[PDB]
Amino acid sequence: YLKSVLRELVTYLLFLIVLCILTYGMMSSNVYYYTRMMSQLFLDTPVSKTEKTNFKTLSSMEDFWKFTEGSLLDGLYWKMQNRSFIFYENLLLGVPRIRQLRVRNGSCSIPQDLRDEIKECYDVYSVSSEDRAPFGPRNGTAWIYTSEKDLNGSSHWGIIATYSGAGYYLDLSRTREETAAQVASLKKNVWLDRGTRATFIDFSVYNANINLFCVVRLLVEFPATGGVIPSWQFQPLKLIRYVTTFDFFLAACEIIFCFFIFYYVVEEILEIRIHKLHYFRSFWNCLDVVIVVLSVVAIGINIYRTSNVEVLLQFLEDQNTFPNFEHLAYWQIQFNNIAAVTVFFVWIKLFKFINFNRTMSQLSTTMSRCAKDLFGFAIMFFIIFLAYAQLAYLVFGTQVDDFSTFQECIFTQFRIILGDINFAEIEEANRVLGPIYFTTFVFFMFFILLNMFLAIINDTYSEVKSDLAQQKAE
Amino acid sequence: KYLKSVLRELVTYLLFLIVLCILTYGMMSSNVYYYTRMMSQLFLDTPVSKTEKTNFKTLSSMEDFWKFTEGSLLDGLYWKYENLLLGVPRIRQLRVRNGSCSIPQDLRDEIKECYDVYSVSSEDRAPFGPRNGTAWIYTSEKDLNGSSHWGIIATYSGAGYYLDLSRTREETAAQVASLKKNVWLDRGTRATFIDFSVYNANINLFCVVRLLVEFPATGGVIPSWQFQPLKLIRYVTTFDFFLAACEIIFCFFIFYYVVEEILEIRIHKLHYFRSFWNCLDVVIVVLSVVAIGINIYRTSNVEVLLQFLEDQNTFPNFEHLAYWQIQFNNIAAVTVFFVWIKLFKFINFNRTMSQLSTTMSRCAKDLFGFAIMFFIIFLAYAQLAYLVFGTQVDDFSTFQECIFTQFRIILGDINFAEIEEANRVLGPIYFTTFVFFMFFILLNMFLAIINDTYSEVKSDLAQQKAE
Amino acid sequence: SVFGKTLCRALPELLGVTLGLVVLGVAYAQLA
Amino acid sequence: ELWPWMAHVLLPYVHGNQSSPELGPPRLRQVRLQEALYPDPPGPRVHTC
Numbered sequence A: 001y002l003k004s005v006l007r008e009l010v011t012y013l014l015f016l017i018v019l020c021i022l023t024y025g026m027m028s029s030n031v032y033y034y035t036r037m038m039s040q041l042f043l044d045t046p047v048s049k050t051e052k053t054n055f056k057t058l059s060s061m062e063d064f065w066k067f068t069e070g071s072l073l074d075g076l077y078w079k080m081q082n083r084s085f086i087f088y089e090n091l092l093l094g095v096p097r098i099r100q101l102r103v104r105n106g107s108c109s110i111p112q113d114l115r116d117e118i119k120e121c122y123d124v125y126s127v128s129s130e131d132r133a134p135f136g137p138r139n140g141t142a143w144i145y146t147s148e149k150d151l152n153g154s155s156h157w158g159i160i161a162t163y164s165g166a167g168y169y170l171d172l173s174r175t176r177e178e179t180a181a182q183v184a185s186l187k188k189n190v191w192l193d194r195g196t197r198a199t200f201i202d203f204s205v206y207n208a209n210i211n212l213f214c215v216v217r218l219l220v221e222f223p224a225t226g227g228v229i230p231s232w233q234f235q236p237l238k239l240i241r242y243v244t245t246f247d248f249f250l251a252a253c254e255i256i257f258c259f260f261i262f263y264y265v266v267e268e269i270l271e272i273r274i275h276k277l278h279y280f281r282s283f284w285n286c287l288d289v290v291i292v293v294l295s296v297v298a299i300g301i302n303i304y305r306t307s308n309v310e311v312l313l314q315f316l317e318d319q320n321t322f323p324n325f326e327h328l329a330y331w332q333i334q335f336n337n338i339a340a341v342t343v344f345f346v347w348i349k350l351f352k353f354i355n356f357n358r359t360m361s362q363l364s365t366t367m368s369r370c371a372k373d374l375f376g377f378a379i380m381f382f383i384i385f386l387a388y389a390q391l392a393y394l395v396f397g398t399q400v401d402d403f404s405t406f407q408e409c410i411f412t413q414f415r416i417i418l419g420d421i422n423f424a425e426i427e428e429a430n431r432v433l434g435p436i437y438f439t440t441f442v443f444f445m446f447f448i449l450l451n452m453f454l455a456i457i458n459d460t461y462s463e464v465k466s467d468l469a470q471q472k473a474e
Numbered sequence B: 001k002y003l004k005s006v007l008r009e010l011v012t013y014l015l016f017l018i019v020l021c022i023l024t025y026g027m028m029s030s031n032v033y034y035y036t037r038m039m040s041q042l043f044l045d046t047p048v049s050k051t052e053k054t055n056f057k058t059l060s061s062m063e064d065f066w067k068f069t070e071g072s073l074l075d076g077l078y079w080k081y082e083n084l085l086l087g088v089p090r091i092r093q094l095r096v097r098n099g100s101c102s103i104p105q106d107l108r109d110e111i112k113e114c115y116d117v118y119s120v121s122s123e124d125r126a127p128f129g130p131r132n133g134t135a136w137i138y139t140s141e142k143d144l145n146g147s148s149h150w151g152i153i154a155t156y157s158g159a160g161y162y163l164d165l166s167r168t169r170e171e172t173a174a175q176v177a178s179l180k181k182n183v184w185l186d187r188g189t190r191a192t193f194i195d196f197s198v199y200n201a202n203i204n205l206f207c208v209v210r211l212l213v214e215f216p217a218t219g220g221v222i223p224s225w226q227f228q229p230l231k232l233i234r235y236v237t238t239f240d241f242f243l244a245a246c247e248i249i250f251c252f253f254i255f256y257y258v259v260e261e262i263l264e265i266r267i268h269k270l271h272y273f274r275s276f277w278n279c280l281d282v283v284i285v286v287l288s289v290v291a292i293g294i295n296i297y298r299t300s301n302v303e304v305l306l307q308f309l310e311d312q313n314t315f316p317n318f319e320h321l322a323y324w325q326i327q328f329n330n331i332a333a334v335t336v337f338f339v340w341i342k343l344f345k346f347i348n349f350n351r352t353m354s355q356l357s358t359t360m361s362r363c364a365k366d367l368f369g370f371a372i373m374f375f376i377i378f379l380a381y382a383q384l385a386y387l388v389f390g391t392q393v394d395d396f397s398t399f400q401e402c403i404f405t406q407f408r409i410i411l412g413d414i415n416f417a418e419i420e421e422a423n424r425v426l427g428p429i430y431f432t433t434f435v436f437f438m439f440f441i442l443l444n445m446f447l448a449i450i451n452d453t454y455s456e457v458k459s460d461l462a463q464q465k466a467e
Numbered sequence C: 001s002v003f004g005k006t007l008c009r010a011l012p013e014l015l016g017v018t019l020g021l022v023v024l025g026v027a028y029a030q031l032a
Numbered sequence D: 001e002l003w004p005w006m007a008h009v010l011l012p013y014v015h016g017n018q019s020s021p022e023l024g025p026p027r028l029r030q031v032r033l034q035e036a037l038y039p040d041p042p043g044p045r046v047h048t049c
């Protein structure tokens, strides 16, 4: 009991600091200024002049023109002070792609009794019940009655709107003039007709002010029985590999972290081979192995994620006129997992209390004595601090230019505490009783009044120590 | 019985404190700063001439002064900040006499005169130049209401060769040109004073201004200035009636305190100057009595300026008013400090506050006994720095300057760009041995005493509570 | 010989205090 | 202004009567990228390059 409690305790502490450093490094969270604003600019906008037909509450099933020629039209032609400018914070990228899942004839069998009324509506997702003929008016493939299974896309398996591997879809040009013309053609005709169950679209962004990539997916699940459900899944992904003098420190911390994980994995195998095995009913050997297993992950994920992201970002120019550039959806499928896995063990790892009792929090909440003592000091320190302020304001009021207004003497004295004295005109304004002020203020503020605070802290620590020792030795 | 008397004393003290706080705060109007700042910026920042930049703050020769007395001075005084003159400015000169050394016999053939540093015994009372009038004849101090000044180099007398200018620009310019044409600023000059006052009818505020130029016996020029604003009507609206009522109730309060103190000292013949809360009350009473005496003195004679707004032609002697105003401020600003400090006897009603109070009262002896051993070393370093650096740094010129520089070093405000180059050896030694013996040793001893006594007193008090 | 013992014995406490420092420091930026 | 700078201070420094013997001529190795840049909106720099 003289080595371990002094060995893996220290090792775990250093492990804690090491992980918290690159937790800070990872903790960018620029989304609140780069994904919240991006989402508001793309999901908080009025389709009409002023109404409730926004992205929050979809307009209507027959509002194809009212919806596509709206905030969506403000994504291909974002005109501000065909264009990419909404709030001077984001730009365009890739090529737009909208999927119109039309549930055409095949919803239910049509008997000879009452098929003449209705037999083809927007039913649940299926294969032989989806779009099989023109979903309304379409001369050719405007309402394309083809299954896009070979489109290199995986179904989202949506709960509110079931997602399949097939469905009518089309892309837009490098601008919105052609996109608007196609939308108008499909509105005069019928492609997103009443049989359409849900509409899906995916998009990317550049946002050159804060260099990153944005992946956004928009889904409007207009139920056949009425209404429409909005869904917006938007998330960023950046690549900052090596340009700075701080990210190299993060890389070094990651290397140190990998060495620590190697140390803990080369240490755990011996506890099962040499030490008696199949003994995990301790709840402590349980965390030791699961933490290591999770830590092995996100190491072979981060490298793979970085490599894949770099490879994908390399080909970011050939998509100006390319047909489809919405293949990055596979990337986020990993990026969020590493965003989740990293927080599925950083708590778990910090959830280790073998070194000190968990239920002994009675000495971390009875420290209110320290808080009470710290309050009977602020009312014994501000009395002396305000008397000096008054004296300075009365003696040096008219001359110094710093002890001019009472609200300024306070800040001047605080700056004096921070070692920002001037003393060029404090003494000039009054040869005697002026330096006396400064000397006594320094002697009573740094020697006799500062140290009572440290004494209070010292006594709080000693009392906590003594109480804990008495409790644990009773 | 204890609570009743204590609460009576506390409420009386609170009334006294609030009356004093209102009285002092009603004397501070925010325009005094603006007035002094603009006056300084007008008389001290404007260039001496259009093509030059040597303002009065950066005079460097006896010739630049002659340009100042014809440049920025006349423009600022006889303006187009929007003030008006009252009375007439006066210019006075203090000189020393030839032959004030015992010249070494060796080189007595080369040099022929000393103009020794200014002193009362070496002043030149003989007439010089064209014996026209007051500007070339010595006048006694008593003949002209004068007093000492305590300049930067030395304290000057009130005598000297004086001259009163005129009201408008032309005659003053002519008189200054006449003084310049002859040798009035001779090699024997040692001080030059310019004095006047303004009213600035826009806002009711007198201003008395005094400029001093010193010529040391080793050449060069040292300028200094003093601007004192004044408000001497004090009966204009309801606010100053409230102020007068506060003044009279303050006088009643101090009368009650002094009679209580005299009765108390009649009761206790001695052993009364040890509680330390009576030794402070007597100081407060004495300071308040001095303040009220000064106020009576400086308000008795205020009418004398009233017959100066009638545009007289003479010099308004206003040095006493400004001096006593400064003194009264320097007394109010200390009696307020002490009455605020005295409040540390009515906040022992709590538990933590009582512990802090008894802590500070129990470790005062050790702190006072150690402040002697600390200050001995402090003064030793001060004397060392004064002897080594007391000629060329400019931060250790005088003795008290060394102490203030060391105190600033404690706050971490060292320069070290001149300490190391003024003396490459024995200077860095002083700097290094000063930081190791202050931040490591002598500042860890106050904390040790305050750390030990706090724990001891808490232990004793807790045991007594549990006893 | 005590100046090394008193520094090797208090290492866990110093690391704990530094851990407190760093966690409060990362918290200071996590609210941004 | 790089060209006036080089023509005014550097070339007189390299050559001259004696002027600090050099031991080696200079070089101007240079990279292009081929990925033409566009000016940022008004303002020196937003975050980084």
Ligand SMILES: C[C@@H](CO)CCC[C@@H](C)[C@H]1CC[C@H]2[C@@H]3[C@@H](O)C=C4C[C@@H](O)CC[C@]4(C)[C@H]3CC[C@]12C
Pocket: A356, C012, C013, C016, C017, C019, C020
């Ligand atoms: C076994 C014994 C000797 O008999 C050694 C004593 C070691 C012990 C004092 C050290 C070990 C780890 C330290 C804590 C850290 O892990 C994170 C924190 C969180 C922070 O908000 C406050 C501070 C706290 C609790 C630290 C408090 C002090 C601790 C508990």
Ligand SMILES: *[C@@H]1O[C@H](CO)[C@@H](O)[C@H](O)[C@H]1NC(C)=O
Pocket: B098, B099, B112, B113
């Ligand atoms: C000063 O006094 C000495 C004494 O002999 C004399 O020689 C000298 O001329 C005097 N100075 C002037 C300017 O006359």
Ligand SMILES: *[C@@H]1O[C@H](CO)[C@@H](O)[C@H](O)[C@H]1NC(C)=O
Pocket: B130, B131, B132
């Ligand atoms: C001095 O002499 C008389 C008065 O004594 C006066 O008229 C004259 O202007 C003055 N100045 C000169 C240079 O004479």
